[model samples]
Target: DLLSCLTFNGVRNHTVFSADSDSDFNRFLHLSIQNPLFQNSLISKPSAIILPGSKEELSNTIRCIRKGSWTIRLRSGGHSYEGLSYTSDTPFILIDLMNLNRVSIDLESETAWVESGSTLGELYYAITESSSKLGFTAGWCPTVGTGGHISGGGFGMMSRKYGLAADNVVDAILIDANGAILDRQAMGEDVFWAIRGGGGGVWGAIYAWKIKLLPVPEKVTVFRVTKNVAIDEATSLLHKWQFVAEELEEDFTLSVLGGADEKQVWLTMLGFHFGLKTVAKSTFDLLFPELGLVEEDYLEMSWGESFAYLAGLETVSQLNNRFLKFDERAFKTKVDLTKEPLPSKAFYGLLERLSKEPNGFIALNGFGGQMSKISSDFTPFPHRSGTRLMVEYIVAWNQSEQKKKTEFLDWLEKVYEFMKPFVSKNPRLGYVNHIDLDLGGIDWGNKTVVNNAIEISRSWGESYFLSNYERLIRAKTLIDPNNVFNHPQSIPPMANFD
Candidate 1:
């Protein structure tokens, strides 16, 4: 009947892909599910998938799903760590937004309207096509869908200087439960604030985002330098980075990627400076001369080209291809934000634990400059100001190594448990983008009604949103009071607390 309604509404023939469609359905389902662990048969799959070609089609499709009384999951870049965008305990319809990936740039206003379905890479490519001086502050991964990324407070190399992807957002177009379209003005300021970084799928489906773009110099310097050192030496460098990185000039960012073998640890220091390489090298040489980054370590390129380098792509042209695969493995991720630098003893302990899990990895992004100037309550993303750095712990395994999944998971859990004393306290903060189901969620057995949702999510809601959690719920009550936009970790409506 719902399919008939879609047909009646003039939805295109290829727009709907049912489970019975087999090959095409499977293809559409896996479009952007970055983590393959969700592919487990134990996870509930959608009954049907829809790829709306335009905003009208998206509105009509939502209307059809609601008419049939079915739940909905929105999929953009499919990079959700929990796979919440495409998997649900209840029977649902998957709205894959790949078809609506379009980017329109307005050079006159120095802003761009990016479709939620568009990847960060696609947005970058569009900016490059429009002008070299303009750039957007978003995630580094080019293939991550802009919808969920921005919704989760997009952070990247440029974040310390320009704030976050969500911070740059000036306006957006959202389609609500009943298929009514609303822009920033229609949705009002509260909701517009919430949707910018309140976590995706909790709000209505986003059609497009109007982001204010920032300008860069003629050349931005980018570099990646690796050092294989003993744990003690590595720990010292890491500890120093905690203090030096956040103090760097507003136009520069220094991040680190680390991995460990059985007895040795390899650390890669990555740099993104808005100016020339000579200046960047001078700054590093004087500020952090421990590792000694020389001339061979840097490459001066256009901001877009620097994006290509950090994204691990061969050229800037490759940024437009959304189907590109980097790491095809089942993985688990956990995040922590730290204002206080961990002791050398903690780093040593962390490296020791990491060495045991061969696939374990960590990325550290330092926060300062513009990041520290923004008030925590200004947006749904409250991890600003005193938040010094973000630590992302990841462990991955081949899809075929299902037998070892538990082993890897156990290792990860152990590491997370060990880190309990070092990370953010009270609520123990986490990045909403790197969502972990380990955090408390709605009790599906109880149907997640208004009476129990707030209490059920209290354990996690504050962890991601901090002081902004209850406010987000207020916005949820206003926007989707019926809880039509609900998910495991979605903000509960106000009545849910009552």
Candidate 2:
């Protein structure tokens, strides 16, 4: 009857899919492009899943969810580190924007308006199909959805020069809790500002994004060099990268992936130089001469192909296949911003712990260059200035290794506690994109602990957004006062209202 009212009130018909009706609901729900860890029966599932292809359908779906008194969860790429998209604690309706993967590149304006459902692969392919000279700054993972990525704080290989995906956004289409569609102008500056890097799903269902494209060389330089600790003194080299990675030329971005088995540890520095061969080599030689690059190590390709290089693919065409389902495994991840270089003693301590991990890794990437030019208040991502590096502690294990989960978790906590002296203090910043649910309540952990969401937003939001957290709350109160767009780590409203 209420659905009939929605239809009568201009809501689209034949757009809703309910798990109650469809026994094969897992197909609709279990597409975890980035996070496949927690798709178990223990995870909370949505009552219905809505795939809105058009603006009218999206508007109607929100209306129906609001009318039914059901909470809402919006999933685009389903890449939330905590898997916040598919699973929610409250009784909810999920709007999976799979059908809305429409993208149109306006060469005239050098901008692209992409739908939320569009994956990075689709976006890059679209850009390549249109013109290879232009590129947008975003994540390296091709399967990642643009919706959450931009909203959470999008970064990538070229971010040192171009800034974040959110930084490049010129406009967006947000269908709010009121079933009203809003653009940049209609949403106002505060709400618009909050939507970018304020963390996705906190705002509303973002159907589309208008991002300004940046210019790129016809062919950029990229390389993959491995440094084994036994032979290469990987830890010592890592100690050196802490100083050069961010401080190096803006045209080059070198991220190190650290992994350990039982006997030894190693780090692979994936270098991307957005220029030609000679410039890339000389730049690398000047800044990171110790990491020495040989001609054979270089792979010259278009910007799009570099994504494939990182994904360990042979061809760029591999992106045509939707890269979802990353082998579900139980895992915990913690993110910390490095303001100063970690003491060499403590840095090796982390690698020692990494050596013991059965199935875990520590990824350290530089975060500076253009990021610092823009102030922290420019976006909800507060770790822009004074942030030299970013460290991610990741541990993943299957259900068979469930008993050892606490062992891994405790070790991660120790690493986090140990390195506090080196990381950004005041509140100890965490990346919204690499969300550590363990960041504690008001923001992190399982679900329940939302005792005082407002208070927690004040206490915890600052950690994520710094002082911008207050402005984000005001934006949430203005646009979605009811907090219809809710999640454990989502931005919360300040008061109760109609």
Candidate 3:
């Protein structure tokens, strides 16, 4: 019956279509938003598209693939910055999980079972609606699908207090390549470690996650302060913030944004303090008086309202419906960590280079407190302990204009080269969630799978995994030795005899 559904009229009639559908196949192949890779025609068209609606459907599809000996590619939100979610050279079938969106909250146990297809906004709204004091530690983007987000080590406003989202996962329901459904207890510790932060769609298809909920204050304080730093006052304030941002109490998190203008730099410091407004004000005043931040600049709101505010959305509704759309402009992101604060002169020099490229920028997220308390080996996400802060370099642009794409890419490359002196050295650690392809290839044109288990174990992997990558690889090999569930950066099995 499923194979018959692949026919032209039958395929079009079904919710999910395949390439066997004559006329509609062409239209479906080009449905993705245009980008440099798509416009330039660098990507290889996939052989088939399989949309699975339920866990049983997913398992059935994989069983079909194993029977036919066909390779498979898995995608949840299709938001990977590197385009690894959908692009591949070999004959592969894409298993898009967009139709499986669902969220179940268990208030009695302070836990929730979130489907991989649901977005971060959905999870936030679900938890907040059930109880004002409950929340999950995840990213800021409202549309980032939970499937890949947690798989790649989810981080956000609550990370300083709760650690990573992966750290909070109590159990997961995944479909192995052979169509076997496994949970934490059945999968064992090695497999469990690999799936949490080892990067999703690598070892298998993650269907749902049973996550432990973190407590949030009934009311929290949120603030945003921006200044044009060409003037001495703003620059001086920024310098002061760098010193106290990480040293502040564990209940506070300061996110600093800095970008280059034509002749100078601009800085914006934003944050959410998970406590009563009065306590937050007192804490900031005592620890960061030099910034001259006043109580009036901060707003006291419920945890859910604060979540909406931090995402730059209106807080009128309990949860905005805009979370369903995924129309972000094409962009590239890179990450690094700082061991020591940059000297004022060096910081200004970095700002000067940023000023030349208006489209390129850096964001520094203060790290310490609860994050430092967690052992690096606790999960596959390793960037913990001794790190002063985390920095992300981003270059975004509208792809409608071909020329603008080139300019943005050039600016990103130049800016990245300019900051080499200040970031981590040796292998140059990177955040797994950021997904920068410039670091190196995981598949390398399929010549060799790069042994991600080994390379990542040595390079940025150690910074995120400590000793977890190897264990993850072993799990991956055992679960999917045939490498049926894969992407550019997915884990590689120990042997490829098949």
Best by lDDT: 1
Per-model TM values vs. the true structure: 0.97, 0.92, 0.89
In model 1, which range of ten residues has the least summed lDDT? 12-21
lDDT by residue (tens digit), candidate 1, 26-94: 777777778898875567878888888889999999998998867899999999988999988888899
lDDT of 3: 0.72
lDDT order, best first, reads 1, 2, 3
lDDT of 2 by residue, 30-60 (tens): 6553554676666777776767768778887
Task: Estimate the overall C-alpha local distance difference test score of candidate 1.
Answer: 0.87
lDDT per residue (tens digit) for residues 1-498 in model 3: 445534422232223334443645445444432223452345665566766777877777777656664567776666677766667666666676666678899989999998887778778888888898888889887767788889998989888898889989999998897789899898888888888888877878898999999888888898887766573544566567766777777789888888867666677778789887788778878877765678787899888888888877765353435234434456666777777776665566557667776767778787888889988778887778877778777776655645687777787787677667777766466777776666554553444545344564355445445556677668877777766776555656775545
Question: lDDT per model, in order?
Answer: 0.87, 0.79, 0.72
Q: Positional deviation of 336 in candidate 2, in angstroms? A: 0.5
Two-way lDDT contest, 1 vs 3, winner: 1
